[PDB]
Amino acid sequence: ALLPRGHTQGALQNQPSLGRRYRNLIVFVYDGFSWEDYAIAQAYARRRQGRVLALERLLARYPNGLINTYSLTSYVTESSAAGNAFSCGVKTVNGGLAIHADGTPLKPFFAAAKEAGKAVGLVTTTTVTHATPASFVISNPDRNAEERIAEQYLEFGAEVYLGGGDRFFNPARRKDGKDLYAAFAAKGYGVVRTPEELVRSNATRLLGVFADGHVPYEIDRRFQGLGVPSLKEMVQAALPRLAAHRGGFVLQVEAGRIDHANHLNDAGATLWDVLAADEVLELLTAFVDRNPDTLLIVVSDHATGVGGLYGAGRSYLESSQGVDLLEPQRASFEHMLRVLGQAPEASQVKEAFRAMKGVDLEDAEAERVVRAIREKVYWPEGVRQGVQPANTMAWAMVQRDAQKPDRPNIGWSSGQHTASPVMLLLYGQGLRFVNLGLVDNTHVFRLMGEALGLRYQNPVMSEEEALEILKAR
Amino acid sequence: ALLPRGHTQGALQNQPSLGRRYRNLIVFVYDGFSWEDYAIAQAYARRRQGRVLALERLLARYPNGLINTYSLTSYVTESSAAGNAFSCGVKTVNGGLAIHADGTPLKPFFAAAKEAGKAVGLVTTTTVTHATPASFVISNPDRNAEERIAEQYLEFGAEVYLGGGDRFFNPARRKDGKDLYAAFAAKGYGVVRTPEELVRSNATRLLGVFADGHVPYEIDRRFQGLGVPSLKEMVQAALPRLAAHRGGFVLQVEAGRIDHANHLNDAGATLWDVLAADEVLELLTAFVDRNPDTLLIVVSDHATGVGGLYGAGRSYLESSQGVDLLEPQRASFEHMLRVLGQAPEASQVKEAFRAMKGVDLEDAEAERVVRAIREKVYWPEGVRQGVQPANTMAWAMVQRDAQKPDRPNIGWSSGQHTASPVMLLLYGQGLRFVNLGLVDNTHVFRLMGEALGLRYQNPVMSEEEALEILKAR
Ligand SMILES: [Mg+2]
Ligand SMILES: [Mg+2]
Ligand SMILES: [Zn+2]
Ligand SMILES: [Zn+2]
Ligand SMILES: [Zn+2]
Ligand SMILES: [Zn+2]
Structure with missing residues (x-):
């Protein structure tokens, strides 16, 4: 019930500084993205597309390291606790959004940013109300109460919301029959529901909801003709709107279905969502190149699967097949x-x-x-x-x-998340001397706060406190 | 024949410099060690042993990054091509030691180091003639011809050889019935076959062979009472012998059976060989702290398995079980x-x-x-x-x-090596400004050459050439 021998030198106390300040912050989450996924996409781009993956170029040049992803009581996190670590800077119990297992609310980072005058955008291939975007803006004891979260999104008032989840906005799907689209329109949002509407729109603030549930996998969009936007198409709409705001902006982009494909144990779906993310990376880095007041953080929230290309044939000589x-x-x-x-x-x-x-x-x-x-x-x-x-x-x-x-010859440890440390990467001007090493996922909160001058603190709960609460549930 | 689009920005062209020079060099290979292995051991040390893994402390402070492990014709390497990348600085076909697929020999780094007057030690839990050590010192078209490698070790003349493999030195076991212990003794080597003999010996040069094949797993040594040394005990004998040499020394320490445990899909055996490596890490870093003319490289040669602790229970809340x-x-x-x-x-x-x-x-x-x-x-x-x-x-x-x-709740992608990039870590004086990122495994060769001022080159074979050769087998 006190700290392990050596705690003063552990990853939690490894809190490297950016040493730079920024006006704008883009956070690109690769949900469920493991180093096995990385190796497959890296190889596929070179071998089958004759190109170097943009993510390889970044990891080969810009500061990157590793985050520990464990949550407060489990060495394997899920998405709300992982997002909470990023957005609130503290470990939580798996399940709630910006909240502790006892109901203590936390203030997540994009809420702090909005209070300081930044425009906020959430762009994802999951339901737009899913855990990773939601954990950055609002607090709720149940990540799955997405019908309510959609109401919280209206009250929060972010400038851009793009993703899936018509079932949580459409009066013909919501359990309460409420037309939330109409309510967003009353607050001035342009409401778009197809790729065509998205690109045509000249509304300043945007709500775009493109599927009943999660947006389809890239592999399905690409080859089965589904009329849904790519992650890139959604970012192309959000980025210029956020960039126009005088006070600066914060944006979360989520490649949220890497996780889902890894859950299915479908290496081909994982690959195409990683390749879709790579197209987005090219967009985001080109924006940062033109906008040095902007920091880009690229991070995985945890590994899932994991789906490894494994040794095949005599002396593993056939493994690339x-x-x-x-x-x-x-x-x-x-x-x-x-x-x-x-x-x-x-x-x-x-x-x-x-x-x-x-x-x-x-x-x-x-x-x-x-x-x-x-x-x-x-x-x-x-x-x-x-x-x-x-x-x-x-x-x-x-x-x-x-x-x-x-x-x-791609196998899978599991259909669930794993405990592996995962990617953290910084893309910005003047970071050449930043040495990350292995940090805790809560350090992403500190980096975001340093970058924008928005350091604040959220309350902590100990592992033993949390386990007692969980016992009583 | 042509390189992929963007090759000038790929990981092969990320070749960061140490910017320091050293007299001695220790290379600590975690064979087959993945980031899932790491997460399990990190968690076990804290939760069940009340302590922070020394490897955690090191990744949380000293420069570390990632190596791509693919070989010349396969995205999944095995140990001989992985060792060659380190020791020879070029990609090779899986199977050969310090040699290309057409029989072109290569000069591995510890051979160059001995030519320049360095003492050489090889210490491992595998057979002493196994691929990871042998690839640093000798050339042989077949990594499995360990009876011949043992003969090659006689002419190479390393100051210390420690590990398994009595079947390759014992006259009663070698097919040719020749008594290689007698030949090494004739050259002045102390020969030891047990832990007690090892610690008692005052021989300046040492051949220590402690089991018929590989040395037993740490878990078996520890709990089944087997009379074999730990990796620490072997290193304790080797290090002061090598440190006495006036010209400096190079040393390879191999935690070689992390790989074998992951091949078995035995997470408990993997854990204890990682923990046994961790005890050795404490020993090596203390040596470096006292000898700043010494660089320590800690590196995995590839991932194996991989064995991931996965999400278990409601909201994955029971995963630490x-x-x-x-x-x-x-x-x-x-x-x-x-x-x-x-x-x-x-x-x-x-x-x-x-x-x-x-x-x-x-x-x-x-x-x-x-x-x-x-x-x-x-x-x-x-x-x-x-x-x-x-x-x-x-x-x-x-x-x-x-x-x-x-x-x-630990699962496995496979029984074989995987493609994932893996750990590379530098422990030394004056490296605070070294930013590694993702490099190719061949960069370890450049790092060793820079460290000792012993840069040289080995011939390159192209993937097309190699594939032609392999066709014609
Ligand atoms: Mg997510
Ligand atoms: Mg080995
Ligand atoms: Zn997630
Ligand atoms: Zn998931
Ligand atoms: Zn190996
Ligand atoms: Zn192996």
Whole structure:
């Protein structure tokens, strides 16, 4: 009940300074992004697109390090506690937004920024009310109360909100039947619901909601013709609006479905959301190049999966085949499941894998998929592989040819988040002497506060205090 | 033949300088060590041992970054090409030691160091002739020809060789029946085969070989009472011998069985070899603190597995249980398989898991192990989980209680190496301004050459050339 021997030299006390001040702050969260994902996308860009990934160029030149992602009582965080660490500077229990397990509210960073006259933008491929954007602006004991969070967004009044989640705004979907779109319009927001409307809009403040739930994966947008915006298209609309504001601005961009694809154990969906993020990176760095008063932070909130390209063949000499084998993919497991519906036949499964993964399943493999979808019978199991039926789908298309991968030699530790430290990267003018090393995720809060002159403190709870509360729940 | 678009900004062209010069050099390789391994050990030290891992303290303070580990024709390397990148500064085809795929020999760095008058030590928990040490000193087209490597070690003449591999020196074990211990003794080497002999010896130069193959895992040494040295004990014998040499010294220390544990999918065995490495780290950094003419490089050669502590329980709130569930473990899967012999009964499998992993196997789980050991029937399969029967043993003790882990909630992407970039850390005097970022693993060669003023070059082979050669095999 006091600190481990050596605490004065641990990662928590590693609090490196920027040594620079800024007027604008962009925070680009790669949700669920692991170093295995990085390696696959890095290789894919070079080998299959003959290009160097923009993220590789940044990690090869600009200050970067590592964050610990553990939450207050668990060595594996989820998104609200991770976002809270960023936005509030303190460890919380998994589950609440800018709040402690006892209900103590915290003040998150973009709320502080708005109070200081910065415009605020939230842009994501998740529901716009999801944990990562929401943890930066509002407090709520239940991350999943997104119908209420949408109301909190209206009252908070950020200049730009872009993402998914029509189910939380549309009077025909909300449980209370309220037309929140109308209420945003009454406060002067331009409301947009398609890519076309988004780009055409000349409204200064924007609410854009482009899907019932999360925005589709890049792989599905790209190859299945879905009329939804890319993350890039959403940033292109937000950035000039925020930049026009006299008092400066803060923006969160979230590549929020990297996490989701990693949950499915779908390496091809992960890759395309990482590649979609890379296009955004190019946009954001070009903006910072033109705007040296602006700091860009690129950070993963935790690892998920993790989905590693693994050694294949004699002396692992065939390991790169798994990268090639991603290029034929044309849809995610999520879209496949949608296509297949609730009572697919083995023959239909087999065709879906052929058409959308480039995979020729054996009878017994397609049958496993049928059982998982129809009878909730999972293979090999459903605890370590806790996301179903997608994880059974991944195992159904496992590599069989040990001499040379016939299907991607990418495996998965789990269908859940992992405890690995993950990427933290700074892109800005004058940071050459910043040495990050391994810091705590709460240090992202300190960096944001230093950059903008918005350092303040939020209350702390000890691990033992939190465990007692959790015992009593 | 042409380089990818953006190659001038890639990680290969990130070649940061030490800006300091040294007399001695210690290279500490964590073989197969991933960021998931790191998170588990970091958590175990704090939560179960009440202390901050020395490696945590180092990453929280001294310059560290990442290395890309891919080899010349594969995005997943093995240990010989990884070592060559370090010791020779060029990419090679997996399998050869300090040699290209067409038989072109390369000059590895410790050979250059000896030519320049440095004493040389190799200390490892693998067989002393294994790829990571051997790649720093000798050339050989086949990393597996360790009987010949042992002969090459005789002419190389390193001041200290310590590790496993009696099968490669013992006249009763070598195919050619030749008594290499006698040959090393003839050259003035003290020969030691046990920890007591090692500590008692006053020989200036040392050959110490402590097991028939690899040295036992730390967990087995520690709890099964085996009479073999720890990595620390081996380093304690080597370091003062090397430090006495007037011309300075180079030393490789290898925590070489982190890799093997991750291959097994045995998280408890991985933990204890990481912790054993951590004790050595404390020893090496104290040596550097007293000898500022000495640089310490700490580096993983690639990730293996990988074995991630994953989200378990409601809101992942029970995920730290897996860390706790490691403390009752008392042996590795390798030691357990030794005990179980070739025709175990389920009841004996069930007893081994109880006594050595603290796991209560169901009847069906115990039977899967028997079938794996006796019939080479593997579950769930044997390709993604390519290390058997150990990977089946891991799956036999998978977590079953989804509300709160009853066995460690640690999962594995595979039984093989992965593509993920890994740790590179510098511990020395005067490096506060070194910003590493993501570099190629071949940069370790440039760092060693800079450190000692021994820069030279080895010939490069192109990926196209290499692929041609491999075709024609
Ligand atoms: Mg998120
Ligand atoms: Mg090794
Ligand atoms: Zn997340
Ligand atoms: Zn998640
Ligand atoms: Zn290795
Ligand atoms: Zn290995």
